[PDB]
From Swiss-Prot, chain A:
It is found in: Virion. Coiled coil: none annotated. Forms the muzzle assembly at the distal part of the tail. May serve as the gatekeeper to control the ejection of the cargo proteins. The chain holds residues 1226 to 1274 of 1371 of the full protein. This is Muzzle protein. Signal peptide: none annotated. Homohexamer.
Swiss-Prot record, chain B:
Its main location: virion. This is Ring protein 4/5. The barrel is composed of five stacked dodecameric ring structures. Rings 4 and 5 are both composed of gp34. Podoviridae-like phages usually possess only one such ring. The tail is thus rather long. The keyword Cytoplasm does not apply. It comes from Bacteroides phage crAss001 (Bacteroides phage PhiCrAss001). Forms the tail multi-ring barrel with ring protein 1, ring protein 2 and ring protein 3. Signal peptide: none annotated. Keywords: Virion. GO terms for cellular component: virion component. Homododecamer.
Amino acid sequence: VSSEFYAFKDGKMWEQFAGDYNMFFGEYKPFSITFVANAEEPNDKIFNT
Amino acid sequence: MNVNEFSNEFDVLYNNIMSNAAPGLNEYEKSVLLTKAQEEIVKNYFEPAGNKYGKGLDDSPKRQIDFSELIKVGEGVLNTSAPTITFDKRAKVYDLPADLFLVINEAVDTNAGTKQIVPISYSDYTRLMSRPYKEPVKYQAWRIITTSINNISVELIVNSNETITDYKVRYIRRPAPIITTNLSSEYGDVTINGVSTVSECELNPIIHSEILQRAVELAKAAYQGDLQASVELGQRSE
């Protein structure tokens, strides 16, 4: 709407990208990032740190 | 240093100044490495050729204070319960203490008098038994090890016409393990030397630094995984 992004859930309008971090619709949701670690993949490695 | 200090200070040395930069050891692994390190330190500082100074048990004040809390005096018990066979006709079998690591002085109290025991090698026994008399000198007795079952059995070859009334043994007691936590709490049934609970160091604080440094070196070698490092630091295992 104009120069701002909005969302509608549970009968209320939620302005996006304006609240506190990691708070979706008043609830805290976690964040994560997964990445495969395969360097020199024929070799067997002990993953340490 | 309490066990908590051995664990906390392993990570100021092994783990790149507690930076989690090196691999990371559990408390069971640290306990195992500390136990192995203390055994290695005892063995190296006992033999003069095993350390860097060429000095053995009683060759300097530092060495005397190192083994001060291991030296124990105990009596041998006659092994008359088991009617075994002795290699010498006049050998009275005696059982030694169970917590025995290295013997350094033995004496036998006879009716004639106290006699210092000489641990006689298998060559000297054959040499001295090829002669006319075949008895020790007036102020000494011989000792050779015999058939032993889950213990240490010694034949005391004292001169004939004499009876043994006592047998005192001064030895280095077997060190107790170093354990930094109750192993059963997180690791199922792992024991270091049969004890699963916290075990402090039974040694003088003077060599605690030596033991910790040796443990750190052993950890770094076991983790570098090179065969060369393992065989190089395996030299000092004796």
